[PDB]
Structures are given as structure tokens and as C-alpha cells.
Design a protein around this ligand. Structure first.
Ligand SMILES: *[C@@H]1O[C@H](CO)[C@@H](O[C@@H]2O[C@H](CO)[C@@H](O)[C@H](O)[C@H]2NC(C)=O)[C@H](O)[C@H]1NC(C)=O
Ligand SMILES: *[C@@H]1O[C@H](CO)[C@@H](O)[C@H](O)[C@H]1NC(C)=O
Ligand SMILES: *[C@@H]1O[C@H](CO)[C@@H](O)[C@H](O)[C@H]1NC(C)=O
Length: 156
């Protein structure tokens, strides 16, 4: 049994990239990845990670600033299906500002502005970008299907 993505305590949205498969982005306080690794030494896994993230950037038309910043992250695969977990650092205004030039923040600002969440707030405005503040501890991405997007798929 795995926890739900479509829950009252979470925010979620599903990107359909092709007829069958897509990405489910989930803001939650439950984590699915125990470790803190992102073993991408194989070229094929490193490219599936690039492609999941590219499909989010193009659909949301994200323009991520370069601030020499970095969001804590673990990743993992289950038979070619990626699971990416960001351990967010945006609980304060200072933390939101220091983790602003990241894919996580651009995603969250899309949730805030499409009203898919109420727990996202503005912090600092810089370079035409909004730094997002939130109490959510994780942002989860999984390569999944439309029929399963409401339940977290097994990561490994
Ligand atoms: C979701 O996962 C699949 C599997 O990793 C991704 O792509 C295809 O996977 C098959 C193996 O089942 C490979 O033989 C193909 O070469 C892969 N195609 C591509 C274009 O990479 C699929 O792209 C993933 N979807 C998302 C949205 O990340
Ligand atoms: C997530 O966890 C933080 C505590 O770290 C809490 O303040 C926040 O309200 C929680 N949000 C949800 C939706 O449970
Ligand atoms: C990356 O994953 C492979 C798969 O087993 C593993 O052998 C390798 O040691 C990992 N990378 C590092 C630096 O350990």
C-alpha cells in the first residue's frame, strides 16, 4: 500500500506529455525516497531525468534564473520510471531567496499562479522571478499514467 498523491493535505497536478504517460507533480509532507542519492552514472538514466524535467519546463514555460543555487534532491528509478524528490528549503523568506534559481521554485510559482495550491506565497522578487515560500517539505515528480496519478507509484 502506498500513500495517495490526490489527498486533502497535498497539492498535485498532472502533465500529460503523450497519449498514455505523463508526470504527476505532488507537494506533500510525505517522502517516498529514503536515501539521499541520485545515482545517474548510466547514460540512459541520466537522459530520462533530463527528459522528465524538460517536459515540465516546456509545458510550464519556465525560465529558471541562474543564481548558483541548488535544491536538495534524491532520485530513483523503477524499470525506466523516474521518481524525483526535492526536500524543499522555503519555510522562511531567507531560505526561499537562497533556493530561488531552481526548477522546484519555478514549478511552485506555477502552482501558486494557477491556484492549484493555497500554501505558496511570495518572498523576494528578482530578475523577473518570484521566490516562493511554503511550509511543504517535499515536491515529488513521478513518471506515471493517468489512471495511477492519484497514488504514489513504487519508487524502487
Ligand atoms: C516514462 O518512462 C519511459 C521508460 O523509461 C520513458 O521512455 C521510453 O522507455 C522505453 C523503455 O520502456 C525506451 O525503450 C524508450 O527509448 C524510451 N523513450 C524515450 C523517448 O525516452 C518515457 O519517456 C517516460 N516518460 C516521461 C514523461 O518521462
Ligand atoms: C507540512 O509540515 C510543516 C511542518 O514542518 C507544517 O507547518 C505544514 O503545515 C505541513 N503542511 C501540511 C499540508 O501538512
Ligand atoms: C551508480 O550506480 C551503479 C549501479 O549499481 C553503481 O554500481 C555505482 O557505484 C553508482 N555510482 C557510484 C559513484 O557509486
Amino acid at each position: 500500500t502506498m500513500p495517495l498523491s490526490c489527498s486533502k493535505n497535498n497539492s498535485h497536478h498532472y502533465i500529460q506529455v503523450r497519449n498514455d504517460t505523463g508526470l504527476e507533480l505532488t507537494l506533500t509532507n510525505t517522502s517516498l525516497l529514503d536515501h539521499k542519492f541520485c545515482n545517474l552514472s548510466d547514460a540512459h538514466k541520466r537522459n530520462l531525468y533530463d527528459k522528465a524535467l524538460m517536459s515540465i519546463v516546456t509545458t510550464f514555460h519556465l525560465n529558471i534564473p541562474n543564481f548558483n543555487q541548488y535544491e536538495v534532491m534524491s532520485c530513483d528509478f523503477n524499470g525506466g520510471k523516474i521518481t524525483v524528490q526535492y526536500n524543499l528549503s522555503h519555510s522562511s523568506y531567507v531560505d526561499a531567496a537562497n533556493h530561488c534559481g531552481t526548477i522546484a521554485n519555478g514549478i511552485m510559482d506555477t502552482f501558486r499562479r494557477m491556484y492549484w495550491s493555497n500554501a505558496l506565497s511570495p518572498s523576494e522578487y528578482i530578475s523577473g522571478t518570484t521566490c516562493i515560500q511554503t511550509a511543504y517539505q517535499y515536491l515529488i515528480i513521478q513518471n506515471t499514467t493517468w489512471e495511477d496519478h492519484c497514488v504514489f507509484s513504487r519508487p524502487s
